A paper describes a structure:
Here, we present the near-atomic resolution structure of Haloferax tailed virus 1 (HFTV1), an archaeal virus thriving in extreme salinity. Through single-particle analysis, we obtained near-atomic resolution maps of DNA-filled and empty virions, enabling us to assemble full atomic models of the virus pre- and post-DNA release, including all structural protein components. The full atomic structure revealed that the virus has a length of 1350 Å and an icosahedral head with a diameter of ~600 Å. The tail has a length of 560 Å and terminates into a baseplate with three radiating TFs of ~190 Å in length.
Threefold rotational (C3) averaging focused on a single turret position produced a 2.36-Å-resolution map (flowchart S1). Turrets were found to consist of two separate proteins; a base formed of a hexamer of gp30 [turret base protein (TBP); Fig. 4], and a trimeric turret head protein (THP) gp31. The THP trimer then inserts into the TBP hexamer with a longer, 12-stranded triangular barrel, elevating the THP above the TBP. Six histidine modifications (likely phosphohistidines) are found at the hexamer-trimer interface. While all these modified histidines belong to the TBP, three directly interact with the N termini of the THP trimer via salt bridges, contributing to the stability of the interaction between the THP and TBP. Alongside three Mg2+ ions, the THP trimer includes three catalytic Zn2+ coordination sites. Analyzing the structure of the THP using DALI and National Center for Biotechnology Information (NCBI) Basic Local Alignment Search Tool (BLAST) indicated a similarity between THP and polysaccharide deacetylases from multiple species. InterProScan reports that the deacetylase-like domain encompasses residues 199 to 413, ending at the C terminus of the THP. However, a second conserved domain is also reported, corresponding to a galactose-binding domain-like superfamily (G3DSA:2.60.120.260), which spans residues 57 to 198 and makes up the second externally facing subunit of the THP.
Numbering used by the authors:
A (entry chain TE), B (entry chain TF), C (entry chain TG), D (entry chain TH), E (entry chain TD), F (entry chain TI): 2 to 115
G (entry chain TB), H (entry chain TC), I (entry chain TA): 2 to 413
The structure:
Amino acid sequence: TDTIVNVQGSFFSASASGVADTESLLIDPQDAKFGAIEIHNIAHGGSVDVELLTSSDDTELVEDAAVTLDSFTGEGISQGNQIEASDNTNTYIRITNTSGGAIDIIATGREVSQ
Amino acid sequence: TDTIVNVQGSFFSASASGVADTESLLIDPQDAKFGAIEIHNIAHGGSVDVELLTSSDDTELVEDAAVTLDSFTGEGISQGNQIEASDNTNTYIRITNTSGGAIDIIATGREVSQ
Amino acid sequence: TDTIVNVQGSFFSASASGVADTESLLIDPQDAKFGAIEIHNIAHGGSVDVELLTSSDDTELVEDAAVTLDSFTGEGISQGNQIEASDNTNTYIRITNTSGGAIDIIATGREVSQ
Amino acid sequence: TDTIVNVQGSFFSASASGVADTESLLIDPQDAKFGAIEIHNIAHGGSVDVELLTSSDDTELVEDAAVTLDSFTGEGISQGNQIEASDNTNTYIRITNTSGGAIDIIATGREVSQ
Amino acid sequence: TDTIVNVQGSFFSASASGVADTESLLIDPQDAKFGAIEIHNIAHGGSVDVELLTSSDDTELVEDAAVTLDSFTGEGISQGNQIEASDNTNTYIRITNTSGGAIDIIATGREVSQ
Amino acid sequence: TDTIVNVQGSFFSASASGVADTESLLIDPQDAKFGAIEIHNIAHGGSVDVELLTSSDDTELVEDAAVTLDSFTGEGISQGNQIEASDNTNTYIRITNTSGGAIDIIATGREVSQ
Amino acid sequence: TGLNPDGLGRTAAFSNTSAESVSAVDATIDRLYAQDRIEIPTDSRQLFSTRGTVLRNFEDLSGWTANIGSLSAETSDVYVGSQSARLTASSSAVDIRYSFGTAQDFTGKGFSMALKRIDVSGSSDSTPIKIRLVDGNTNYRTFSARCRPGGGDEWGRRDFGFESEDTGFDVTNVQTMTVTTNSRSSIDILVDDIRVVDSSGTGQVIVTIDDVHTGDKTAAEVFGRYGIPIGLAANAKFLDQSSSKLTTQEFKDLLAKPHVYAVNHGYNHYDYGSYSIDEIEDDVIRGKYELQDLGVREPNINHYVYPSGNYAQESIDMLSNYHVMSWGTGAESFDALTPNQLTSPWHNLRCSFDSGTAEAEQAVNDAATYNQTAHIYFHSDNVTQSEMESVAQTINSADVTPITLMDFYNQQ
Amino acid sequence: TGLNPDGLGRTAAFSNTSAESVSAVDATIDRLYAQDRIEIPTDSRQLFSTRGTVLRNFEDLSGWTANIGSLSAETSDVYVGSQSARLTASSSAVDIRYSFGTAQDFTGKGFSMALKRIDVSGSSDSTPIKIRLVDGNTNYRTFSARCRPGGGDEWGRRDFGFESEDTGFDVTNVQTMTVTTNSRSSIDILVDDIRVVDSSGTGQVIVTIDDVHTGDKTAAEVFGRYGIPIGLAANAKFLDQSSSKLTTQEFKDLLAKPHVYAVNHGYNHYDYGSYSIDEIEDDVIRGKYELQDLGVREPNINHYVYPSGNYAQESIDMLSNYHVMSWGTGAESFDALTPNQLTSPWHNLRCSFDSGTAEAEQAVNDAATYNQTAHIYFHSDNVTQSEMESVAQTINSADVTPITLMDFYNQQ
Amino acid sequence: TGLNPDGLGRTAAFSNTSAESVSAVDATIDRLYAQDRIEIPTDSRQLFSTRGTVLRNFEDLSGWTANIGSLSAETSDVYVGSQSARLTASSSAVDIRYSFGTAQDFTGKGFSMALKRIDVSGSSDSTPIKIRLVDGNTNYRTFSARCRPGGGDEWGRRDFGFESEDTGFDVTNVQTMTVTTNSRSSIDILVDDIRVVDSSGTGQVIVTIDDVHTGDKTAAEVFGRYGIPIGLAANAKFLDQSSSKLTTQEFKDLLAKPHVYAVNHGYNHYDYGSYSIDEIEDDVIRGKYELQDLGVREPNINHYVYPSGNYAQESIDMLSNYHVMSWGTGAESFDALTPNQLTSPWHNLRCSFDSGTAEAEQAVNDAATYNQTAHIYFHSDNVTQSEMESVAQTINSADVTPITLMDFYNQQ
Ligand SMILES: [Mg+2]
Ligand SMILES: [Mg+2]
Ligand SMILES: [Mg+2]
Ligand SMILES: [Mg+2]
Ligand SMILES: [Mg+2]
Ligand SMILES: [Mg+2]
Ligand SMILES: [Mg+2]
Ligand SMILES: [Mg+2]
Ligand SMILES: [Mg+2]
Ligand SMILES: [Mg+2]
Ligand SMILES: [Mg+2]
Ligand SMILES: [Mg+2]
Ligand SMILES: [Mg+2]
Ligand SMILES: [Mg+2]
Ligand SMILES: [Mg+2]
Ligand SMILES: [Mg+2]
Ligand SMILES: [Mg+2]
Ligand SMILES: [Mg+2]
Ligand SMILES: [Mg+2]
Ligand SMILES: [Mg+2]
Ligand SMILES: [Mg+2]
Ligand SMILES: [Zn+2]
Ligand SMILES: [Zn+2]
Ligand SMILES: [Zn+2]
């Protein structure tokens, strides 16, 4: 039988340094080559709210559905997520600072096919 | 040996903003390209009942078997599901609002082959 | 290197509405295209016993080995299973009603190669 | 990019009805097409000891290394295993009855390449 | 249908013996053939802080975003991680000794496609 | 779309019968066809220390970094590991007897691509 | 993290896990953050049953005279020993009498008896059962308890409250004791094991308020004027339902007062006989955790009060997993009253002052005089402020210590 | 292993799991291996508040005469009832007097009062507050407690230690009682709810040693000579820090002695006001688990001693999740002293003999004479062996039972 | 579900999990369903060691006269203080005497002493050790305990049972105290810390039955005839083994009786010295959980009884993680007997009536007379019904309260 070596699909990340008190990292699957993402890690330099949004617009965020998924307190990593978003389903992930001061946010995961 | 990069299979989502008190998001695998789905995430803007239904009809929901899978209270994400539905087996997932007010529901997952 | 999109293998389900008090859904891997199945979900409309059986006959169930795997009480979903059965190894999964009344049973999973 | 549907690799099972008090099911990876196995499930109709053995002989079990992995009490399923054996590494899995009476044993899993 | 044997994608490791008290192993995804990594294991010969950094520079670490992910105490293994880094997104993982003495650090995982 | 059956990548094992009191099984990824390994199972016939080592030499073990990963007491199986080693990164896994008497050690897992 | 634990099946080494529900056969926890217990380790059902000494044994019925009704040995349905006594009557009371060989001194002794109701019918399906002590001059002191359906369906101990005394009764010169009932068309009740306990301590009062009505605020002020502890028998569902009920903040503010404490009354007041044991168990469990979220902690939340006073051994068995003690309802002075040492923490009643303060005030005066514990209760919608003041002044002026249920159970 | 549990979300059936941290809403455990509790089910804050009976009520201030200072009703900031009393003075003490309608007998009675400090200023931001009993011959017996910032910031009960007595005082013939302070430029303090408790039992002594100095070894020998229990208020971080502190092995060796026990003092001695409540909580939690690893167990490790004696209701609220009882610091005999029945396990002080043994020895003699509990303390670096011996001989020769903190709390 | 918890390593957010075994460092549980504890938070080993007051400290041996044998200071192997006493004899008893400076009154005082056996040899490797009070007329009152291997291998406290009295002994006029042994070829025993406890309360009796023989059914009837509580020292493996043992249903039926309770005796009766500490620990743990499945709950299942009476400090240390109290075996009246206040919950014996009722009946009469607690025991296969009746009638007619082990430990 044929042997093939499987290397895992395209790495995805979004990051922002010095996100101000109530500002946010908008993770947009439009930035993915495949147009969909699965975020595995959220490294949070301080407290954040994670929010999943559907847009009315194909290309810009105009809030339709919005659900606040979870709140993270202090500094650390939310490892082992599968929060998913795509361009065609107009889904965005917003990570909003709640720390009372400037923080670094790094979100990593994988690109998924639409 | 051959090396191949594996990107993960087609993203699927269903969403509804402002689902009224006793209304529901009907997740229909007919909307999938492959005609079957596996829902991983249910982001629930308030309390919901999740229900798995078989239809008597190939194309429309006429309830045959129905099982209420679980109840979610308040706002959050049911991560790590594998609730599965296909068109050919006429399986539907209904997420019904129970909050006493209007909510946003976002369900995400993956398309599966029939 | 080559990029390929991996969509997941064939959806499988078995279902029965209004299974009477001591009757059962017989999940038969003969109904799978690949002739083997892995059940992930059992949605149980009431109490059930799950049972794994080997047949003496290649095509019909004549009980050889039988093990009662687990008992589920009330309504819900047994998510995240890997109960496995194949035609060639003559393995059947029986989900038997124990509710004291008629129930809906939906089992979902994936076809596996023999 | 190319889309491929991935069906999961060859189902494997070993079973025995009415295994007497101190007798055993010998799971032999020589029975696999690929000559190696990964057992995921042990359905045990009563108490069993699971044992991993290396043979001195390429084709028959003549005990070299033997480790008793675990003891299961009563009836049920050991789901979610990855006990592994191959023909070329002469590895066998023995499931030994300890119930004080005759039991049914069904072990299921997947064939793995050597 | 076609049968293929899937061998898992490229092994990645970074290691350092005798890392002094406040020194660090810089895990750089530039050292990966595919230019991205997912660290699964951190074997820590003593206490360490794990830190995820974005660089301003494409090729050298000049700290932009930095998040201290977690602190490990004493000797052991952090198994089951998915901390991810890529060259193109200029992401580095720093494992910093905090033991009060010299330690061995071994990080293992897998290369991922960008 | 194309359907392919995925059989899982090459089985790997290392074993030793009658390992004396302070002796060890050296698991060497040089013995793998692909030159890297991921150990999933350690079946331990008595107490063992597991240790991850980097060599200074490409082909022989001359200890550079060494971390004692974990200690196992008595007889059993450490199932569900992902301890990883490769030839090119000169990584070895040593399982050292600590029982006070002779034991059987069987380690199983999978070959991984470098 | 470490490597995976020893064993077959799904094994996993984790750093941090979160779960809604965890089931374990065994859990080894190095440091436990679990102040909020639902299921309590203590089984109180039979702890107190053997306290004090057996006075009347019923192993020989020769010492007993049936004055009215009839007395026979029960050898098949026995509480304690080789036999128990069947008390039987048709269209009459039962009165059985034991004459002591020598004068007994029962100063500061409290009385308790094992009881099972087989059948009572007529004017009521229930009777007062009375232990009387009679002196050399034929003066009676009466202590009593209730033989009711539900609570009497299985063998259980009653701890007898003082009821009445003839003037000039000499408790140092007791010549005979009597077990007696009211008159009924049919009586069939089993008795065994009369016990004597030391109750020489000061008299005590417990006050409980049921069902979380808005009037609990005025009650807290009134009983506060004399530092009398109030137990709120709390149903957490009732909070914020209507203007007639406390708000959640008002309830938390009341519990912040040094003399107000909460005890469980079930989330939604599910009483025995109206709901299944499973539904009541859920109500009990939910009541417990909801009150724990409101800050009600261990010694307090180990007490329950029966919704509508309804119970049986079935409910006691279920409740014993969650609570150490529970209280029923009655309307007469002796219903409040127990010796200071209980023999059942499950079968004892409380006296209502919803329908007039006289019996409850009588009970408080009797607790002081006869060295007993009076448990009195009300719903604050049924009682006026001037009635609460009458009761609170009665408690202040009497020789009683007002106490919490926690104090009372810790004394046992 | 079985099949996966009922539910949506990630459900999982496991054999054996290992975790660093587990969070669960519900945990059902068939067999629990969790002897090391951090978070205790018992909330002790208000259990003892209603012990004994209310003597002085303050619901009618007509019975009180302001001898010096001034007295007014507080109807908004009330501990108990409809009102409390505001005691107010400018450049003077406050002395308020209640004459009893009939002579009172206070033999073996202990006094407690509810207190809140609004403002004290002048020589100090604190005052002794004194309950005096005065007899027919105008002899005084004084009991006292401290009205301090922090501990007085919110309503809390003080249990009054004996201070002084006039020769020939007749406790059977008390005609009047006084509440009084020292003189200050400004006084504004609220009082309510004077309570009487039974303290007729033998006198008791508790000895604690703070801060784990090397001199605890000589202390253990000296107090050992007379079998007097020592509580080590232990900070686990301090072990092995320096030659001036116990080693870990020395500490374990001390705890192995039948009369030496440990109580929590926080891992790194974080005191109230110097650190946030969150940092102190972490210190408390870590102190608890580190001492548990050293073998300190349940009844012992349920006690805390405030670092530097600093506390407030904020800290008590936090500590009440982890501990049942805590102790502050004072330098005078009455600071050691409480009735044998407490009404607060949180607000009571200990007397130092770091700066001379006189006050502590006085307290021990007074505990014997007046049937009270004396809590005395020291740092073993401040006290010479001859001083420890003086104190230990004083305890041995006095009519006191030397007791553990565990014993003392189990008595409440 | 939420998102995965903070941290590196394998982290997971679950809804519902099932496990056989969970290991956690920290567990935060919002609502705990874990009534069945294996590990208990309470370490009882040293709680009671300092109760009462030290009478003799042995810190100055000048006050002691060696009448027979020899007395020296032990300054390195010390229980309490600077020194302990070495009692040494060759081919003789040791008798050491302390004359009091003034006549002592020991009415209702119970005696306890610290003991370590270095060497005893001759007729036995053990001795009775006697504390012996002498009045002005040279009448003796003897209290005694046993200096045995195992239980005497390390320092431990014995609580001395009444043994004998000379006619006309005046306990108000005690002039001399004596510590004495039986005669042996070699004696080397260390003593320290004689303690006096208040034991003025009523006499008490505890009855235990070992090893779950079928005769426990007739015992339950017989002791039931007087409401005397029985503890079954239960080995859960023995149930259903043979016709000579209780069935599981019979055992559950016995425990459903108000006067029968169970205590742990290890799953399969593994005794100290016959098995390793690890095997005994497994036996103890399995005994606990199997009895918990049979419905034996917390206060009851916190008691253990040593298999075959075998123990040492090693086994006590292990058992203290699981149980609060344990009992050994003896054959003489004083073996039953302790003061009502213990100083060790681990070193006390029980008196057998397997080989005749005389010593046990003597103990019950002595418990009544001298205000002590008698623990008596039997195996129901060794005892005839008329012997059980003799003992039960003796307990009924004596001035004792028959009590549970739970009651007895809650009194300490
Ligand atoms: Mg779009
Ligand atoms: Mg919205
Ligand atoms: Mg589109
Ligand atoms: Mg269809
Ligand atoms: Mg239906
Ligand atoms: Mg079709
Ligand atoms: Mg077939
Ligand atoms: Mg069969
Ligand atoms: Mg075939
Ligand atoms: Mg072979
Ligand atoms: Mg071997
Ligand atoms: Mg070969
Ligand atoms: Mg770059
Ligand atoms: Mg930064
Ligand atoms: Mg670039
Ligand atoms: Mg190499
Ligand atoms: Mg090294
Ligand atoms: Mg190379
Ligand atoms: Mg009877
Ligand atoms: Mg007031
Ligand atoms: Mg000494
Ligand atoms: Zn109610
Ligand atoms: Zn300090
Ligand atoms: Zn035995």
